[PDB]
Amino acid sequence: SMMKWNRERRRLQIEDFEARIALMPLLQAEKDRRVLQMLRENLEEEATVMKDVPGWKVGESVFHTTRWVTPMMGELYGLRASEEVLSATYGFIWYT
């Protein structure tokens, strides 16, 4: 009984993972827009905040390479409220 029921559960899991693969292109596409939008929302505020400091280059990278480097949590939410940062940092870990 367990053998047949477990094999059915594997067929169900494949069905649930197929649904994920059907949506990953859409979720991936809108993640990139969200991430790039938040970086430009920090580049603009960087220009206004850092304008009298001498030698500052707004949007200067910290890497020698020009390759795209995935930002860390700090770069994205550098200028944002605590509530929207806690969920983006400890939202999953603390969810029951």
Binding site: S1, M2, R7, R9, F17
Partner: protein
Amino acid sequence: MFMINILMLIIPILLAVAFLTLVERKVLGYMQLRKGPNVVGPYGLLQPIADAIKLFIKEPLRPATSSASMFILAPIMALGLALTMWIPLPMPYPLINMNLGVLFMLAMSSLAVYSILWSGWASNSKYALIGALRAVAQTISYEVTLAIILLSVLLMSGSFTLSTLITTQEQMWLILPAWPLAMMWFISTLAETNRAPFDLTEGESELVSGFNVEYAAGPFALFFMAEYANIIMMNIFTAILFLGTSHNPHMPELYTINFTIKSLLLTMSFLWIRASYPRFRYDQLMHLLWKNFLPLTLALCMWHVSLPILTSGIPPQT
């Protein structure tokens, strides 16, 4: 709304513990041709309240030459862990839904041994320390079989989520393909809870004083409540683990009624067993573990690692 849920889980646990003492005294009484409490309130329904008030208005003695800090910590540690082992249980929805719930219940039950060790250590009583070392030796020894047996069953379930055991047993109870593990799990819970015939701690006739000997009044009550909250929790675990209940998302209360009746029957089996058999010697319940169960449990652990593979019946991961 969550803080209300915690109270809806904590208060009824203590009440169930309160009336489990009445049920034990009456079930054993009838198995002994007696009646049991039937004077304090109709059918003894007020006996638990009389005992609770009695204990907490009684003198809380602690010997002067005894570590106060560890003397007080043990009842706190014992009762705090007893209630903590209830938050991940699905009934059918758990208060706190953990991805590793089965593994969280092993960890919490492995800290409860400290309450026994601290109880007899902070008493400066030679007899009390003897009980603690024996009680600790018994407790940790039978944890080995709990962990290995539990791992063996989870090789048919797929994960450590307590709610996935409900999905595993949707077609059939796990007791049918795992009755050898159910037999050894049930007795391992009797010895883990220090119940008969594994209760030499309470067996003063054995010339041994229990670690809960130098405790009176309320602090004795806290040790008692934790012990009886573990009996119910272990039997709740023994039901969710080997006697699965079908979960209908639209009528959750149907699950809870059946799941509660199974919990009571397994919890009333402890009273039944306590009334029928003599005690083990301390060395006989160590051989029962190190020479009978563990050789068999390791054999069955191997079988349940390869049985899902040779039958092509490996459970999912998610």
